[PDB]
Amino acid sequence: GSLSTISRALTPSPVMVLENIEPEIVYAGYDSSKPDTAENLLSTLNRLAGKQMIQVVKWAKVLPGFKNLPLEDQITLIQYSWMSLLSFALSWRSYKHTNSQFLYFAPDLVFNEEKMHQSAMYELCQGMHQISLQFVRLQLTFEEYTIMKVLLLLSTIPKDGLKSQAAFEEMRTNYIKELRKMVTKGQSWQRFYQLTKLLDSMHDLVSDLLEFCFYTFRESHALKVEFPAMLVEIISDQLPKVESGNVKPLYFHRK
């Protein structure tokens, strides 16, 4: 049941709320009895991504501030950041559970180098792994991770803007302020800078991952790669928007 009377009386901070609303563990439903072909591994990754995206929507709904954005913008933001959010969480799990030795997609799906090759994504996996290694270098904290994940949700917008741009900017700025406050709680700027540089670098990796995903999607029949309905909707809609130059990454330390 609800314990809202106690929860409200505890007056949780936004960071406490972020910890509270973190999605629980999602299993890939990996079947180790089936061949580790690219078609099977990518289909499994896509199934996992679809399941994670269901949880992303649930999470976003209870994210402080997100309710202030119109429905169209809520959808746009979830759609435009899907790969970023999942990739960032992937590096987090990899860091937390394996000290960034492996790619921890799920408890039942942990990639070593062999799986990276088998998935047809070796080089892109290595790019992902670089983020995981940055988490070790920085000793990223969970608090930092949770705020950064919100910033990723708020990192990619239409070139011509959102329906309610000012409301979006207010929310994004509020989370930037949360990050600043968190890093400060003699190298505060340095930390803020490193974390925000890392956020910027997510755009570099994610745009590659999306191009690859779009290619796989276009070739999905030939490659025998399955996509769940959630991803079909996301990808089919975003694909021409990205390709026409209408998707705008937001950067801290670039134009």
Ligand X SMILES: O=C1COc2ccc(/C(Cc3ccccc3)=N/n3cnnc3S)cc2N1
Ligand Y SMILES: O=C1COc2ccc(C3=Nn4cnnc4S[C@H]3c3ccccc3)cc2N1
Nearer to K ion, 58 or 253 (CB): 253
Residues that bind ligand X (CB under 6 A): 38, 42, 120-124, 216, 223, 225
Q: What is 28-73 written as a DSSP string? A: ----TTS---HHHHHHHHHHHHHHHHHHHHHHHHTSTTGGGS-HHH
What track of x and - describes contact with ligand Y for positions 35 through 64 (by CB under 6 A)?
A: -------x--xx-xx--x------------
* Bridge partner list, 104: 110
Q: Smallest distance from the beta carbon of 202 to ligand Y, in angstroms?
A: 11
Residue nearest to ligand Y (CB): 213
Residue from 86, 154, 162, 234 binding ligand Y (CB under 6 A)? 86
Torsion of Cα atoms, 70 then 46 then 147 then 1, to 10°: 70
174 known ligand binder: no
Cβ–Cβ under 8 Å, residues 180 and 62: no
99 known ligand binder: no
* Bridge partner list, 247: 158
Q: Which amino acid is at 171?
A: M
Nearer to ligand X, 80 or 227 (CB): 227
- Burial (CB < 10 A; 0-12, 13-18, 19+), residue 201, is middle
Closest CA to 131 of 104, 80, 92, 180: 92
Binding status of residue 153 toward ligand Y by CB under 6 A:
no
Cβ–Cβ under 8 Å, residues 28 and 109: yes
Binding status of residue 212 toward ligand Y by CB under 6 A:
yes
Q: Smallest distance from the beta carbon of 251 to K ion, in angstroms?
A: 4
Q: Which residues are annotated as a binding site for aldosterone?
A: 46, 52, 93, 216
- Provide the binding-site residues for ligand Y, judged by CB under 6 A: 42, 45-46, 48-49, 52, 86-87, 90, 105, 121, 124-125, 128, 209, 212-213, 216, 225
Q: Which residues are annotated as a binding site?
A: 46, 52, 93, 216
